[PDB]
Design an enzyme around this catalytic site. Structure first.
Site, mmCIF file in Angstrom:
data_model
loop_
_atom_site.group_PDB
_atom_site.id
_atom_site.type_symbol
_atom_site.label_atom_id
_atom_site.label_comp_id
_atom_site.label_asym_id
_atom_site.label_seq_id
_atom_site.Cartn_x
_atom_site.Cartn_y
_atom_site.Cartn_z
ATOM 1 N N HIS D 102 30.878 35.877 39.709
ATOM 2 C CA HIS D 102 31.230 36.282 41.064
ATOM 3 C C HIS D 102 32.417 37.237 41.064
ATOM 4 C CE1 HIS D 102 32.531 36.238 45.174
ATOM 5 N NE2 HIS D 102 33.527 35.396 44.958
ATOM 6 N N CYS D 121 37.904 28.779 43.266
ATOM 7 C CA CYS D 121 38.208 30.023 43.973
ATOM 8 C C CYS D 121 37.445 30.133 45.287
ATOM 9 C CB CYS D 121 37.898 31.233 43.092
ATOM 10 S SG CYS D 121 39.053 31.514 41.737
ATOM 11 N N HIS D 122 36.169 29.745 45.294
ATOM 12 C CA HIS D 122 35.335 29.873 46.485
ATOM 13 C C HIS D 122 34.593 28.586 46.813
ATOM 14 C CE1 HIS D 122 36.268 34.081 45.843
ATOM 15 N NE2 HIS D 122 35.717 34.374 47.007
ATOM 16 N N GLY D 123 35.040 27.459 46.261
ATOM 17 C CA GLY D 123 34.356 26.196 46.465
ATOM 18 C C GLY D 123 32.962 26.164 45.888
#
Ligand code: HEC
Ligand code: HEM
Ligand code: HEM
Ligand code: HEM
Ligand code: HEM
Lengths: 55, 68, 376, 157, 48, 70, 122, 243, 59, 376, 48, 52
Positions: D102, D121-123
């Site tokens: 990502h 970082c983004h769950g």
């Protein structure tokens, strides 16, 4: 009026009529800005006296 | 004020707990509703956080009143 | 007469002392002098900090701490540099918004606007590579996330990424080359600023009325020196408050942890002045499309003097749409600091679309309609 | 003049190529691109971290129940459908790259709703077999080239 | 203004636009950029 | 230096023959009201759009957090 | 299409009259006109139209611009007796400028340029 | 996710929060004593030296006597060997472990972080530190904790590797202050807040002087601006244009 | 209305070489007064909390 | 014209394409363009070098070694940056000797000469503090010997010395601040070079005949571009020979030893371009008098446009005396690399006395006699 | 021809030289730099 | 060097990889470097060790 009154209430940590006096003076000044000049003193006095009477 | 060798914070926290009975009821409702879980993912951390945030906000200025 | 005998006296007299300037300039015309003063402040405090910083991954954080505690006046210099970067970006953003409001990039001042956009791009790159130098957690992980956008370019993406890193990951050669590039780019900023100012002196400034002002011009040095001093003192007050009373207000607490390449933070965010670009990037679920959208934003900024019609107070429809544009960019600033969420993704997409709509549809077309309304 | 420009062009190309190549990877960096990982000091149920090419590698000794749990996940629940056998020569020793495709974030071992790797970082969650199940990550976790020797030593890189 | 004001004022006509021969000879610089990039990178198996 | 044809009479007084900051107290409330009269519409539409979109976004984010609960 | 514009034209005229009313109220306090809002530096046709004018018209335009800039510096407006006499829509430039732009459009259809350039300083 | 974020900490009425307020230097001294007896068994504070405690927390002789009770590795001697010596003022605070790996090994894999900048290195620093130290509560329903971990809702994720370390009377203060767990936590939080910002008092005094000076200079510069612009702001222009 | 005195003008204002040393001594005394006022206000407000208060208390 | 519509193209055209230059300039007028090329080369090589150098003790020597053996093309970059300082000083010295021979600083080109002398001083300081950076024995001990010469000013001595060092001896703070000062000073060199060239363009250049050349002027950009290219190719040949075949010929072998503050080398001499000043300093048996003589040399250099009468040929006595001056300066350069001996002390004293005699007695008085002979 | 050439030609007379009052007014700047240096350094009561 | 002054003189800034293709092949330099012992670590217990 409401914002300034609650602001002073939180700032002084206690409750009295002085916060209402500050709110009334500020409201009168904001209302009284830009008019002839018996007014910018009188209007804050009127608002502060009204707040004192309300308390 | 008199400073005590025992910890005043648990007593103050117990004192503020009647002020947050609604959040406690919501947490207990959550804890009852996930009782029959089998997947291991159901938890009630959010309502627990609501209750302890209410209690912490009550008890925060009264804790430092008892400490030097 | 004495300035007629030496060239350097003559150039300074012409461009600083006796330069004609519109008499009705208000305090929105102080952003340029303040931006120049903030660039000079950044250069001075950075030159002073470079005598105690070590650009190595084993000594960077430790030398920052030693400069903070043991170097005399080192805390003042370090906080002054870190918060002067934010005040530099505040002053430059307000300068650009002044130009957007008044349409100051129009003819014959296209070169001034284009050199301004060049200056802003160099400023962004300078601040980004300067933030990596403390080698904290945010300094490491933001450089990792942002320089990993090069892999969105096909075929030759990873090769450019590894060439910029000096290895297979962000490590010591990255920090050393970032330190050299960061020392170097402010001098290019000073040169670009000299060129940008000398481009404006060909025709002069515009005025708040938006009319020709050649009938009412006064000397720059006698009159606008004091007017610039007043704004410099208002900026010095805010600078003093930020340095001494709230030094970590505009920072992040994770940059006080040393860098760890094996444990990322939960919320990687940049400094506040890169948050609108970051929101534009995060709103689009495609890396190539996000990079293209950022490039198209800056292309629309370059193309403003040739597609933009519509200026100051007397052009009222575009004057009203300016405030919608300002609300949109501040919403983009706020959205960048928040986590990824379906409603924030939707709102960021709508806000980016409105920014493009304002830049490419409102400025030509509504400007043309109001020119036809006023003079048709 | 064309004869002179033949040499001018080659000289300019040589100078630019000399300047550009100095930012490329140095000899010691290129030498530190291969690392040996011991599997004798790894017990079942734990994740070891080894820095290969500056990168965290989540070599994890897997149990039989864990292997069955990773195998029982079908391809319809995966954003990128791929089986556990295709991503691991040895089902007991899973060698995986711990950097999300990502943005470049490093997940944490022993965390997540799928009992695998939780990227914070983004769950974004990962399973125990290194395949994407939840989050904004389009691709799966990278499996580096590796082989097994006769002394339980794994060559990576 | 010179960009879109000129299109809106009717100053951009076919008689004022550059010719197709001019567009052919100007656009021939695209092959020069391609061969310059191929000379700089030399990323080919073209030499055989 | 750009000859401008113009017909006028201009008068100017010495800066030591007038006051400096005394009128600043008289004109201060009028200038405050004039500033808000001139910029009232733009500041209001900025405030409405920014705070309304921010409030809607924060409300729906809180609803999203509540929907994840058990 | 044809009468499409036929009807779409009175709505344009109404919006134009409302726009000119609002802006002319804004302009009249500075003593300006709608034609004073055109800059010879901003447009080379306006620079061409301005040198086709008699000298007294140019002197009046410069006087109005000087008065407006002085008013803008002083943060003032015109007094009531001057403000009631202001005529913001009395054109002095639109006929000459329309002729200049028509000439430039005529030259462009035959491949010819305009016989003037931008104002270049230094 | 709420559980990954953890419970937010309330805002406590710290006496040093206002810009006019100094540190409580008696609390810094009592906070250092909590550091030596409870914290320093597993936390390093590697950017502090005994020289910096002088004039803030101790006298010179007290800090010298404190430093002289520590063993500091020094060398090499004339025979090329490593020896030990008494600590001095220029020495840094002793680290309980030689390296990160033994620190992880002594604590189940978790590395106890350095505490010199832990106050400025966390969001809502002092409040989070105090609420974490006094906040080892019972876990909610459906949340299980593995062995070697302890529940704390202020720690993000809710499962911390640091056990309860503050106990009532576990420190004997030399000023007669009774040492409950909350008093110990408040004092060590004060010491850590000093450690993150050691010059906060001097910065605030300089900021007060700077704000006063710049506020006076703003009025003087406004005066000199209006004096220079006065012949222009009051000029009279008369012309023949009426319009 | 209010106007600077002529005799005070002829002494400290007519020459820059006399004006500048007067400026420097006034700057020195202004800095001393500002330092005194700020330090007195800070020490009065934070009495009992400083290190010197503890040291003087232990005498 | 296309260059008449953009102000950048107008300045570039006026000062680089159509600038009128005398047509009889020989190859001794190529010193300035070569000096500018060497300045640009030094800036480029150094900015590339700073991406692999660490400005800390116990890392500096190892970082230079890692640069030399591990960075691709790093050895070429280091040797080019080291020998480029020597070639820069060769070119600038020949430029100054040209100006001394032709009387190029006279009216109306006094500002050109003064800005040149300022450039030379900044070049000397830049080269010295850059020589300290590799942190060898010669670097440390030369920095020790030169900076501990401020103990000649009475009273305010060791205070200035300890403030320069950041301590009580040359150590890590001195190296760390020398890195920042050395990075920064070449941009001041570039700005001073731009000002220096702009000062010459006010009146144009002199010619080998020494007469007014306004009647015979040709365009710069066509005729003097290839003429500069020829000399640049000669300089590139010498530069390539020095880099690839004799990279350590002009250096000192002691600078390949890591610095030891407790052991001093047998002979402490600077680089060759500093040797004449070193001989002037070392010849006088008093530190304060040596510093006074060094300052007096540069003061007499500044005073040269106002005291120097006499130019190139057709002024034959001063023309002949120039060769004695050149021999004197080269003798002082040779003497600086020797040991202190009574005969070398006597010869260095005589050479310094003759240098002052030529700069302060021959140039005014013999020049006045030549003017009285020619036009009296 | 500015400098020694002016005095060789006889252009520097008793006239065209600065007066005593001019030299005193210029010479009064000597105290200003002394007071400025003493203000900047502040070596109080350092005079022996 | 390896049989006389390797016992008393240092060759820092020199690695075994800098001899491949100069005076040894890759396998000869590998076999030569595998005969030395160097300090490596720390391991998971935080202890230094020696390796080939
Ligand atoms: C039993 C050894 C031990 C003791 C004694 C100890 N700690 Fe902890 N501490 C740890 C460990 C292990 C962690 C990290 C836990 C984790 O990250 O999961 C930690 C973490 C912390 C953290 C940071 C938590 C975070 O969110 O990053 C702080 C602050 C802290 N300790 C302060 C203290 C204080 C104050 C004391 C003394 C009352 C103390 N420590 C004593 C083991 C200890
Ligand atoms: C010649 C000019 C400059 C030099 C030598 C310089 C040098 C440095 C150095 C050495 C650091 C690391 C020390 C530290 O982290 O505190 C730093 C940090 C930084 N610099 Fe500068 N700088 C210069 C100009 C600028 C400019 C123009 C900007 C514009 C925005 C800038 C922005 C930053 C930022 C954001 C940081 C990170 C601060 C932090 O978070 O700690 N610098 N600079
Ligand atoms: C380091 C950054 C900058 C410096 C030092 C600088 C300096 C200046 C100065 C001194 C002026 C004259 C007065 C003024 O308007 O304040 C000016 C005007 C202008 N600047 Fe900037 N500027 C900078 C950045 C920018 C940027 C980023 C832009 C646009 C993208 C820009 C666009 C303009 C324009 C259009 C004008 C003319 C406006 C007018 O006169 O009405 N500048 N600049
Ligand atoms: C980096 C250093 C320098 C650069 C880039 C530079 C550049 C130039 C250039 C380009 C010219 C015109 C072409 C030529 O005559 O060579 C010139 C002329 C001149 N330079 Fe230099 N220069 C430098 C150093 C100096 C120094 C150190 C001095 C004297 C101490 C000096 C004094 C002069 C003079 C007097 C002229 C005019 C010569 C004449 O026209 O007869 N310059 N310089
Ligand atoms: C922006 C411009 C420059 C930069 C960044 C720069 C950078 C450096 C660096 C990083 C070093 C230490 C590494 C090494 O010595 O190999 C160095 C050394 C040196 N610099 Fe440069 N430099 C610049 C310009 C100059 C100039 C203009 C001169 C001479 C007038 C100069 C003279 C030297 C010398 C003599 C050394 C010693 C080299 C040696 O003996 O190894 N530098 N410079």
């Amino acid at each position: 009026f409401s914002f300034t009154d609650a602001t002073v209430e939180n700032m002084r940590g206690k409750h009295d009529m002085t916060s209402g006096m500050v709110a009334g003076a500020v409201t009168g000044f904001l209302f009284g800005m830009g008019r002839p000049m018996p007014q910018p003193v009188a209007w804050p006095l009127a608002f502060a006296g009204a707040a004192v009477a309300a308390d | 004020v008199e400073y005590t060798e025992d910890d005043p914070k648990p007593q103050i926290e117990e004192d503020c707990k009647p002020h947050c009975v609604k959040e406690w009821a919501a947490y207990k409702a959550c804890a009852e509703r996930i009782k029959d879980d089998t997947t291991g993912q159901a938890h009630c951390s959010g309502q627990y956080f609501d209750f302890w945030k209410c209690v912490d906000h009550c008890a925060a200025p009264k804790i430092f009143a008892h400490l030097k | 007469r004495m300035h007629n005998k030496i060239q350097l006296l003559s150039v300074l007299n012409t461009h600083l002392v006796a330069y004609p300037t519109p008499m009705n300039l208000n305090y929105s015309w102080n952003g340029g002098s303040l931006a120049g003063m903030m660039l000079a402040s950044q250069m001075l405090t950075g030159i002073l900090l470079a005598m105690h910083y070590v650009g190595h991954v084993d000594y960077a954080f430790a030398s920052v701490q030693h400069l903070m505690t043991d170097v005399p006046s080192g805390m003042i210099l370090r906080y002054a540099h870190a918060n002067g970067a934010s005040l530099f970006f505040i002053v430059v953003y307000l300068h650009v918004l002044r130009g957007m409001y008044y349409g100051s990039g129009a003819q014959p001042r296209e070169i001034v606007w284009i050199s301004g956009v060049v200056i802003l791009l160099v400023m962004i790159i300078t601040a980004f590579i300067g933030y990596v130098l403390p080698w904290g957690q945010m300094s490491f992980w933001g450089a990792t996330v942002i320089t990993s956008l090069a892999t969105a370019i096909p075929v030759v993406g990873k090769h450019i990424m590894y060439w910029l890193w000096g290895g297979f990951s962000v490590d010591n050669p990255t920090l050393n080359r970032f330190y050299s590039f960061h020392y170097t780019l402010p001098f290019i900023l000073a040169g670009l600023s000299v060129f940008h100012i000398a481009a404006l002196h060909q025709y002069g400034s515009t005025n708040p009325l938006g009319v020709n002002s050649q009938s009412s011009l006064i000397s720059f040095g006698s009159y606008f020196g004091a007017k610039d001093l007043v704004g410099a003192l208002f900026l010095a007050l805010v600078f003093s408050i930020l340095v001494f009373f709230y030094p970590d207000l505009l920072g992040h607490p994770d940059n006080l942890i040393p860098a760890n390449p094996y444990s990322t933070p939960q919320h990687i965010v940049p400094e506040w002045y890169f948050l609108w670009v970051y929101a534009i990037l995060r709103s689009i679920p495609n890396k190539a499309m996000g990079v293209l959208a950022i490039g198209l934003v800056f292309a629309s900024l370059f193309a403003m003097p040739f597609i933009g019609l519509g200026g100051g107070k007397f052009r009222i429809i575009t004057e009203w749409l300016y405030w919608t544009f300002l609300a949109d960019v501040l919403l983009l600033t706020w959205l960048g600091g928040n986590e990824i969420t379906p409603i924030t993704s939707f709102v960021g997409q709508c806000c980016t679309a409105y920014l493009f709509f304002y830049l490419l549809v409102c400025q030509p077309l509504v400007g043309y309609l109001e020119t036809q309304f006023a003079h048709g | 003049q064309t004869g002179g420009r033949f040499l001018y062009a080659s000289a300019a190309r040589l100078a630019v190529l000399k300047i550009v190549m100095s930012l490329s990877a140095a000899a010691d960096t290129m030498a530190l691109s291969s690392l040996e990982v011991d599997l004798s000091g790894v017990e079942e149920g734990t994740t070891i971290t080894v820095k290969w090419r500056g990168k965290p590698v989540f070599i994890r000794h897997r149990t039989d129940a864990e292997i069955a749990q990773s195998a029982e996940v079908a391809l319809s629940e995966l954003r990128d459908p791929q089986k556990d056998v295709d991503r691991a020569i040895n089902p007991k020793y899973l060698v995986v790259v711990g950097i999300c495709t990502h943005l470049g974030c490093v997940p944490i071992s022993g965390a997540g709703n799928y009992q695998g790797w939780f990227c914070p970082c983004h769950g974004s969650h990962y399973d125990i077999s290194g395949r994407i199940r939840e989050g904004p990550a389009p691709y799966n976790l990278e499996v580096p080239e590796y082989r097994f020797t006769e002394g339980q030593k794994v060559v990576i890189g | 203004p010179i960009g879109v004001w000129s299109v809106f004022q009717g100053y951009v006509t076919p008689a004022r636009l550059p010719s197709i021969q001019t567009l052919t000879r100007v656009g021939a610089w695209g092959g020069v950029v391609v061969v310059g990039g191929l000379y700089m990178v030399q990323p080919w198996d073209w030499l055989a | 230096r750009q000859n401008i044809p113009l017909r006028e009479i201009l008068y100017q007084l010495s800066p030591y023959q007038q006051d400096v900051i005394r009128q600043t107290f008289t004109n201060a409330p009028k200038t405050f009201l004039r500033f808000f009269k001139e910029k009232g519409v733009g500041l209001a539409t900025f405030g409405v759009l920014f705070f309304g979109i921010k409030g809607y976004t924060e409300h729906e984010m809180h609803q999203e957090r509540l929907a994840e609960r058990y | 299409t044809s009468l499409l514009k036929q009807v779409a034209l009175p709505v344009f005229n109404s919006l134009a009259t409302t726009y000119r009313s609002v802006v002319g109220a804004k302009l009249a306090k500075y003593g300006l006109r709608f034609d004073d809002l055109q800059d010879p530096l901003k447009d080379e046709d306006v620079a061409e139209a301005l040198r086709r004018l008699p000298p007294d018209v140019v002197v009046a335009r410069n006087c109005r611009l000087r008065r407006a800039l002085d008013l803008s510096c002083k943060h003032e407006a015109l007094p009531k007796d001057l403000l009631e006499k202001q005529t913001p829509e009395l054109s002095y430039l639109q006929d000459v400028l329309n002729e200049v732009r028509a000439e430039r459009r005529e030259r462009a259809q035959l491949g010819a340029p305009a016989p003037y350039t931008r104002i270049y300083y230094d | 996710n709420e559980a990954a974020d953890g419970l937010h900490a309330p805002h406590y009425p710290w006496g040093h929060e206002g810009v006019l307020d100094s540190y409580d230097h008696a609390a810094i001294r009592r906070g250092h004593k909590v550091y030596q007896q409870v914290c320093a068994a597993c936390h390093s504070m590697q950017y502090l030296h005994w020289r910096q405690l002088v004039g803030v927390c101790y006298t010179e002789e007290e800090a010298k006597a404190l430093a002289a009770e520590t063993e500091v590795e020094d060398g090499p001697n004339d025979e090329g060997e490593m020896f030990t010596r008494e600590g001095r003022l220029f020495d840094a605070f002793p680290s309980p472990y030689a390296n990160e790996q033994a620190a992880r090994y002594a604590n189940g894999g978790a590395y106890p972080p350095d505490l010199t900048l832990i106050s400025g290195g966390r969001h809502n620093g002092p409040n989070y530190i105090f609420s974490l130290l006094t906040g080892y509560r019972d876990p909610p329903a459906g949340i299980s904790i593995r062995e070697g971990l302890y529940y704390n809702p202020y720690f993000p994720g809710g499962a911390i590797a640091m056990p309860k370390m503050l106990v009532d009377g576990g420190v004997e203060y030399e000023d007669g202050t009774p040492a409950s767990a909350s008093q110990q936590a408040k004092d060590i939080t004060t010491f850590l807040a000093w450690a993150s910002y050691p010059y906060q008092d001097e910065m605030r005094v300089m900021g007060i002087k700077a704000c006063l000076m710049i506020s006076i200079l703003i009025g003087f510069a406004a005066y000199s601006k209006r004096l220079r612009w006065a012949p222009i702001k009051s000029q009279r222009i008369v012309m023949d244009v009426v319009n | 209305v209010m106007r600077l005195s002529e005799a005070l003008y002829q002494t400290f204002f007519k020459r820059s070489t006399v004006y500048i040393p007067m400026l420097l001594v006034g700057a020195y005394f202004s800095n001393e007064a500002i330092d005194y006022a700020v330090d007195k206000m800070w020490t009065t407000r934070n009495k009992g909390k400083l290190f010197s208060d503890i040291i003087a208390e232990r005498t």
